[PDB]
Structures are given as C-alpha cells and as structure tokens.
Amino acid sequence: MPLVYMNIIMAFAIALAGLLMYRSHLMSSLLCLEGMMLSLFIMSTLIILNTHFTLANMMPIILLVFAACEAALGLSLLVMVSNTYGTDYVQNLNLLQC
C-alpha cells in the first residue's frame, strides 16, 4: 500500500478517535462523524479509480447521499436537545443510567 492509502486510513482513525473522545459540544462530535464520511469517500474513490472499476464509480456518490441523511438526522436531534437545555452539552444527557 502506498503512503496515500495509509494517510487516508490514518485520517479515518483520527476521526473515529475524535468521535469517541467526547469533549463538551455535541456539534463537535457531529463534525467528526462528517469527517469519517469524508475519509471513507476519498478511500473508496481512490480504490475504485485505481482498479478502473467503472460501475463502482457511482457508489461514492451513493455514499455521499446517506452521509447527508445521517448529518441531517444528527442536527435534528441537536435541535431538540438544545430546546430542552439551552445548550448542546452532552453532560445534560444523563437522565437514563445503566
């Protein structure tokens, strides 16, 4: 594997790590979700272009579409949470325990 593939995979790992390690703002985590989607898009596009798989050229576009549905979903939830607390802090989501 060339250095570009490892750079893309490292980008995905950094974003996943960013998602997993929460700070305070919910939106900061939605941004890491978007970054994971972007890294997947670039990785799959590079693999598809390199092997000249013509039909697969439509799959990153599809991959983009469901990226928006996931973002629009998340932002929707971020609205409701904010409407309850006046803040998007994940500390407030502690009504339910394990």
Within 36-95, which residues bind another protein (CB under 8 A)?
36-47, 49-84, 86-88, 93, 95
Collect all residues with Cβ–Cβ distance below 8 Å to 12 and sequence separation of at least 6: 36, 39, 40, 43
- For residue 92, the minimal CB distance to another protein (Å) is 8
Give the nearest distance from C-beta 13 to another protein in angstroms: 9
Q: Which amino acid is at 22?
A: Y
Q: Which of residues 1-30 bind another protein (CB under 8 A)?
A: 1-12, 14-23, 25-30
Three-state SS at 89? strand
